[PDB]
Write a protein that binds this ligand. Sequence first.
Ligand code: HEM
Ligand SMILES: [Cl-]
Length: 397
Amino acid sequence: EPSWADLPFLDFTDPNFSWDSPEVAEAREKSWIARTPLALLVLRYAEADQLARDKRLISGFRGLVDMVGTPEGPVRDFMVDFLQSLDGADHRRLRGLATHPFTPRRITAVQPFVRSTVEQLIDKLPQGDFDFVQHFPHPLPALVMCQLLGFPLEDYDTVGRLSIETNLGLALSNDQDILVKVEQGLGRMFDYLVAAIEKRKVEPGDDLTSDIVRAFHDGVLDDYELRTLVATVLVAGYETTNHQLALAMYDFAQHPDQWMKIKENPELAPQAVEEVLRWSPTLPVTATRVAAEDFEVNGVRIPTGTPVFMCAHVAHRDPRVFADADRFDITVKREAPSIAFGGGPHFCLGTALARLELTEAVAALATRLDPPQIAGEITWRHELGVAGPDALPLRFG
Ligand code: HEM
Ligand SMILES: [Cl-]
């Protein structure tokens, strides 16, 4: 395309690439949209928010899977069939059956559980240098997922590890050898999920697994769709929340004075979480979309079949919308929210829940503990999709 000529080039698949490099900022200043090998990347806030819900764009995940050349198999079947790849009737149908526990009223019903779990987890924290992921960021969303999906709470470590051993990001590749491990992980996770699904087929409960089992008994979805949807919810609910919590500690370790502001006034925790989501969103690229038809935004024309990815990280650093955009500050009253959860019909199902987990965690950690200090080498996730510490050695003073 000729209208693509003057667009800035960025390659976020480069192991040398950084989201906070000067060339990224320069690209955003120059253009609302950048060119990448995989997609057009929307860099500014206004456009990134609006395009995530624009009806001219459908889900881009299937396009991604094919574009990276993921070979045929159970892993590919999951990535092309799961909720995030679906649109229209099929999407509304599946998403609807899993909505109820995430309604911002049922979120309030789970709030006391989230609080006490956080409280318990803080009680069992080590006194010295310890990995925050293993001791908090992993257990918290794992226990929450178990409570939502109806798994025994004692299985929280197993259920978490199941998701860890099935890194879907690694499978967005044509490599056969790395794929074997992802496929092995997927199978093991299904083994656990299917067994729990069969239990709920006999005796349905109040949980989400039982909810979806009820829809199966009413013939709204088939058996394959059932277990995929249970798998979709677990992965989407565990990985992001885990990494985002670890990123929260990372931010506050860099800015220990603002942690103290929350200690003094715990009511600052809601907008503190928002600042964490703004400054370091666990998914730098939020919404992956493909053009369903020909159209034109700001002169740049997008033909049918063009992948368009919303870059939340860069859009959060947009000075057109955010005051002192590159400074981490919890106290500034923001006019616009973070868009760490995407938009449109695909908008994060667990937005309210994720915010509840982050808020309760930050409030209690800041009230009870001294500012976090990095105590060793941080292990970062290098794959496409979820970003953040896989292991975070820290101390609370
Ligand atoms: C802070 C952590 C989280 C972040 C940053 C996050 C972000 C996102 C984003 C950006 C999307 C893509 C939306 C789009 O295409 O516009 C998404 C989808 C989704 N999220 Fe989350 N999420 C988080 C936690 C959770 C939790 C706790 C759950 C609950 C299980 C959850 C469930 C889902 C589901 C089921 C989808 C697919 C929905 C669909 O395709 O319609 N997420 N999330
Ligand atoms: Cl439709």
